[PDB]
Amino acid sequence: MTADLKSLAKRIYEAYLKNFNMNKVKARVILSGKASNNPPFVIHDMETLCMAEKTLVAKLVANGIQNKEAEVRIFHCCQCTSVETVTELTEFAKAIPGFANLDLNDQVTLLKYGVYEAIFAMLSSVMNKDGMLVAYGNGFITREFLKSLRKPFCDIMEPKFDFAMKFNALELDDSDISLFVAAIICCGDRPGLLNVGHIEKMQEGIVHVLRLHLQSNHPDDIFLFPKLLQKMADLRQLVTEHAQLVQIIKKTESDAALHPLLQEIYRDMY
Numbered sequence: 340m341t342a343d344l345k346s347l348a349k350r351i352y353e354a355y356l357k358n359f360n361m362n363k364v365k366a367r368v369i370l371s372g373k374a375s376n377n378p379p380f381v382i383h384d385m386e387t388l389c390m391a392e393k394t395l396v397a398k399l400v401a402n403g404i405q406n407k408e409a410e411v412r413i414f415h416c417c418q419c420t421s422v423e424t425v426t427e428l429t430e431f432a433k434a435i436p437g438f439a440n441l442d443l444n445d446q447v448t449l450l451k452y453g454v455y456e457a458i459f460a461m462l463s464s465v466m467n468k469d470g471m472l473v474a475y476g477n478g479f480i481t482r483e484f485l486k487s488l489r490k491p492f493c494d495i496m497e498p499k500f501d502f503a504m505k506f507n508a509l510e511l512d513d514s515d516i517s518l519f520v521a522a523i524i525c526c527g528d529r530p531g532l533l534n535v536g537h538i539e540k541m542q543e544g545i546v547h548v549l550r551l552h553l554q555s556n557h558p559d560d561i562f563l564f565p566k567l568l569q570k571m572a573d574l575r576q577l578v579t580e581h582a583q584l585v586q587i588i589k590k591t592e593s594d595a596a597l598h599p600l601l602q603e604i605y606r607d608m609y
């Protein structure tokens with residue numbers, strides 16, 4: 340672990356912090372409650388959802404959804420967070436060594452397949468066995484209430500909870516996750532890459548830092564690196580299955596539109 344690797348790991352850790360408002364330390368302190376007696380507003384039934392919705396009533400009417408189904412309202416706002424994280428993620432990639440120096444069409448292809456793998460990865464930071472933080476930790480929507488929603492919407496988030504529980508068990512911190520997200524973006528395995536060489540050289544540099552950092556920060560978890568590698572595989576499958584459910588929902592739910600930026604991501608993906 341040379342001084343250059345430490346630096347590369349902290350400069351990525353820094354970009355991670357300065358591009359993602361919500362991190363695992365903020366979420367773990369909100370969820371713990373040892374830094375405030377003002378817990379987030381809990382959303383467990385349809386009534387509590389409408390109470391919370393009273394805060395963004397303007398945005399609901401401007402999008403033509405206030406009178407739609409609760410399932411449509413939730414996952415119409417869920418799409419905004421996705422677009423935000425795709426933006427935060429794009430600016431985060433500008434910190435990966437040699438990423439900006441790649442062909443523009445490559446940068447899009449890497450983010451096209453990686454953002455949702457990174458999203459579901461970071462989404463674990465705000466999750467526990469009972470729910471997830473929403474609105475920058477101001478709210479907490481419960482896992483049961485998400486399952487109670489009618490099909491197929493109840494089938495959207497439950498798989499992600501299943502991933503997070505086993506993923507949080509690894510007990511990664513923001514230092515580990517920033518390098519994990521950087522690794523997800525630099526997969527030379529994506530379909531439709533022009534310079535498959537430049538990327539691989541860029542990945543092995545990021546992957547190298549991830550392994551060494553994980554061996555130093557979590558020395559007792561001897562095979563923590565291999566496990567995360569398996570977690571990347573799992574994430575690819577998770578996003579693959581996700582895009583399938585989003586297509587099925589776009590074609591069988593007239594009230595559920597697909598955000599333009601998100602459509603392009605999902606188009607001709609899997």
Ligand SMILES: *c1ccc([N+](=O)[O-])cc1C(=O)Nc1ccccc1
Binds near residue numbers: 392419474
């Ligand atoms: C999205 C869907 C529903 C609600 N709600 O009914 O409370 C809120 C949101 C949302 O994204 N809120 C928010 C506000 C400010 C900053 C981030 C997120």
Ligand SMILES: *c1ccc([N+](=O)[O-])cc1C(=O)Nc1ccccc1
Binds near residue numbers: 472473
């Ligand atoms: C949907 C997708 C992602 C997130 N997130 O990671 O913060 C949150 C949501 C969501 O459903 N937010 C929400 C907040 C308040 C009321 C309803 C829904």
Ligand SMILES: *c1ccc([N+](=O)[O-])cc1C(=O)Nc1ccccc1
Binds near residue numbers: 400415596599
């Ligand atoms: C994002 C956050 C909140 C709301 N809302 O309270 O209605 C809506 C959105 C949003 O992204 N709506 C949308 C869906 C599809 C295409 C463009 C915009």
